[PDB]
Motif scaffolding. Structure first.
Motif, PDB file in Angstrom:
ATOM      1  N   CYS A 161       6.716   4.900   9.930  1.00 46.54           N
ATOM      2  CA  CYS A 161       7.975   5.322   9.328  1.00 46.54           C
ATOM      3  C   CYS A 161       7.990   5.037   7.832  1.00 46.54           C
ATOM      4  CB  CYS A 161       9.146   4.626  10.022  1.00 46.54           C
ATOM      5  SG  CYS A 161      10.780   5.086   9.406  1.00 46.54           S
ATOM      6  N   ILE A 170      16.424   6.253   7.953  1.00 41.81           N
ATOM      7  CA  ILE A 170      15.445   6.006   9.005  1.00 41.81           C
ATOM      8  C   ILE A 170      14.538   4.835   8.640  1.00 41.81           C
ATOM      9  CG2 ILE A 170      13.862   7.722   8.068  1.00 41.81           C
ATOM     10  CD1 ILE A 170      14.430   7.014  11.803  1.00 41.81           C
ATOM     11  N   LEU A 210      12.657  17.896  15.069  1.00 39.23           N
ATOM     12  CA  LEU A 210      13.107  17.362  13.792  1.00 39.23           C
ATOM     13  C   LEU A 210      12.487  18.076  12.596  1.00 39.23           C
ATOM     14  CD1 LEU A 210      12.972  13.526  14.596  1.00 39.23           C
ATOM     15  CD2 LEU A 210      14.988  15.007  14.608  1.00 39.23           C
ATOM     16  N   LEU A 217       9.636  17.775  11.105  1.00 37.22           N
ATOM     17  CA  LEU A 217       8.960  16.884  10.173  1.00 37.22           C
ATOM     18  C   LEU A 217       7.644  17.522   9.749  1.00 37.22           C
ATOM     19  CD1 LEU A 217       9.630  13.355  11.723  1.00 37.22           C
ATOM     20  CD2 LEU A 217      11.003  14.695  10.125  1.00 37.22           C
ATOM     21  N   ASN A 270       8.349   8.391   5.161  1.00 40.99           N
ATOM     22  CA  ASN A 270       9.689   8.578   4.633  1.00 40.99           C
ATOM     23  C   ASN A 270       9.848   7.921   3.269  1.00 40.99           C
ATOM     24  OD1 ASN A 270      11.605   9.775   6.949  1.00 40.99           O
ATOM     25  ND2 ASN A 270      10.057   8.440   7.877  1.00 40.99           N
ATOM     26  N   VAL A 318       8.403  10.375  18.667  1.00 40.61           N
ATOM     27  CA  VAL A 318       9.076  11.160  17.636  1.00 40.61           C
ATOM     28  C   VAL A 318       8.866  12.640  17.921  1.00 40.61           C
ATOM     29  CG1 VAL A 318       9.173  11.698  15.186  1.00 40.61           C
ATOM     30  CG2 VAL A 318       8.870   9.333  15.923  1.00 40.61           C
ATOM     31  N   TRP A 370      17.571   3.279  18.794  1.00 39.49           N
ATOM     32  CA  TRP A 370      17.534   4.525  19.552  1.00 39.49           C
ATOM     33  C   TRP A 370      16.489   5.515  19.027  1.00 39.49           C
ATOM     34  CZ3 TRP A 370      21.280   4.364  15.656  1.00 39.49           C
ATOM     35  CH2 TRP A 370      21.399   5.505  14.855  1.00 39.49           C
ATOM     36  N   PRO A 371      16.238   5.626  17.711  1.00 40.23           N
ATOM     37  CA  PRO A 371      15.196   6.568  17.269  1.00 40.23           C
ATOM     38  C   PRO A 371      13.792   6.136  17.643  1.00 40.23           C
ATOM     39  CG  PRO A 371      16.715   6.038  15.487  1.00 40.23           C
ATOM     40  CD  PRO A 371      16.888   5.005  16.543  1.00 40.23           C
ATOM     41  N   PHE A 372      13.593   4.864  17.984  1.00 40.01           N
ATOM     42  CA  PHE A 372      12.277   4.320  18.288  1.00 40.01           C
ATOM     43  C   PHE A 372      12.110   4.009  19.772  1.00 40.01           C
ATOM     44  CE2 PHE A 372      13.801   3.193  14.087  1.00 40.01           C
ATOM     45  CZ  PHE A 372      12.815   3.698  13.265  1.00 40.01           C
ATOM     46  N   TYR A 402       3.647  15.850  10.112  1.00 43.03           N
ATOM     47  CA  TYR A 402       3.826  14.480  10.586  1.00 43.03           C
ATOM     48  C   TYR A 402       2.562  13.967  11.265  1.00 43.03           C
ATOM     49  CZ  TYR A 402       5.815  10.386  12.862  1.00 43.03           C
ATOM     50  OH  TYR A 402       6.067   9.102  13.289  1.00 43.03           O
TER      51      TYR A 402
HETATM   52  O1  82Y Z   1      17.213  11.279  18.372  1.00 44.49           O
HETATM   53  C1  82Y Z   1      17.337  11.085  17.209  1.00 44.49           C
HETATM   54  N1  82Y Z   1      18.611  11.340  16.554  1.00 44.49           N
HETATM   55  O2  82Y Z   1      19.700  11.821  17.302  1.00 44.49           O
HETATM   56  C2  82Y Z   1      16.148  10.561  16.400  1.00 44.49           C
HETATM   57  C3  82Y Z   1      16.260  10.440  15.024  1.00 44.49           C
HETATM   58  C4  82Y Z   1      15.187   9.967  14.288  1.00 44.49           C
HETATM   59  C5  82Y Z   1      14.008   9.613  14.927  1.00 44.49           C
HETATM   60  C6  82Y Z   1      12.847   9.095  14.079  1.00 44.49           C
HETATM   61  C7  82Y Z   1      11.998   7.950  14.381  1.00 44.49           C
HETATM   62  S1  82Y Z   1      10.897   7.773  13.176  1.00 44.49           S
HETATM   63  C8  82Y Z   1      11.299   8.996  12.179  1.00 44.49           C
HETATM   64  C9  82Y Z   1      10.723   9.420  10.901  1.00 44.49           C
HETATM   65  O3  82Y Z   1       9.712   8.939  10.511  1.00 44.49           O
HETATM   66  C10 82Y Z   1      11.392  10.421  10.122  1.00 44.49           C
HETATM   67  C11 82Y Z   1      12.593  11.144  10.677  1.00 44.49           C
HETATM   68  N2  82Y Z   1      13.557  11.750   9.780  1.00 44.49           N
HETATM   69  C12 82Y Z   1      13.365  11.893   8.336  1.00 44.49           C
HETATM   70  C13 82Y Z   1      13.901  13.201   7.762  1.00 44.49           C
HETATM   71  O4  82Y Z   1      15.192  13.475   8.173  1.00 44.49           O
HETATM   72  C14 82Y Z   1      15.282  13.555   9.551  1.00 44.49           C
HETATM   73  C15 82Y Z   1      14.853  12.259  10.234  1.00 44.49           C
HETATM   74  O5  82Y Z   1      13.030  10.909  12.057  1.00 44.49           O
HETATM   75  C16 82Y Z   1      12.421   9.720  12.739  1.00 44.49           C
HETATM   76  C17 82Y Z   1      13.890   9.736  16.305  1.00 44.49           C
HETATM   77  C18 82Y Z   1      14.966  10.208  17.043  1.00 44.49           C
END
Ligand code: 82Y
Length: 131
Positions: free
Chosen positions: A94, A104, A50, A52, A98, A45, A39-41, A55
């Motif tokens: 990713c 993740i 988020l 980040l 990270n 992003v 689901w996160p992929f 990023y």
């Molecule tokens: O919809 C979501 N959750 O409900 C969701 C979550 C995570 C991602 C995701 C894909 S790659 C990536 C990534 O590289 C780093 C971070 N993180 C590192 C820090 O904490 C929060 C997360 O989130 C991602 C995408 C969607």
């Protein structure tokens, strides 16, 4: 500020289909899209939501299975090896951003471990398809 999603159409660039690209969209993607951690992929992003930091400065090529899927449906890729690069770009992004061992990362590693298994079922020989 999130940039526009990567182009899934190429109004000047060759449009092509392959029995290998056919196996990707209809077999390996379905298996990946229905994975527990897929689901996160499934979409680009959302770094701003988020929060980040830096990023898009660290990640030069943002990629996701939602973009890869629509590219397979628009014959964006010339051959299958070109599509395997977008999966490798997605996973490595990713791993680069990270901490090794985080949730993740573990979700992309399990998603990648299945991907390497699935593409090994592609046809060894490349044959065009009547698009
Ligand atoms: O919809 C979501 N959750 O409900 C969701 C979550 C995570 C991602 C995701 C894909 S790659 C990536 C990534 O590289 C780093 C971070 N993180 C590192 C820090 O904490 C929060 C997360 O989130 C991602 C995408 C969607």
């Amino acid at each position: 500020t999130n940039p526009p999603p990567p182009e899934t159409s190429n109004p000047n660039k060759p449009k092509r289909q392959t029995n290998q690209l056919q196996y990707l969209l209809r077999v390996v993607l379905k298996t990946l899209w229905k994975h527990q951690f897929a689901w996160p992929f499934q979409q680009p992003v959302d770094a701003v939501k988020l929060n980040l930091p830096d990023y898009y400065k660290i990640i030069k090529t943002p990629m996701d299975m939602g973009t890869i899927k629509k590219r397979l449906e628009n014959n964006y890729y010339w051959n299958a090896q070109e599509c395997i690069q977008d999966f490798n770009t997605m996973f490595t992004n990713c791993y680069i951003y990270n901490k090794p061992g985080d949730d993740i990362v573990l979700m992309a590693e399990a998603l990648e471990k299945l991907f390497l298994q699935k593409i090994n079922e592609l046809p060894t020989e490349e044959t065009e398809i009547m698009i």
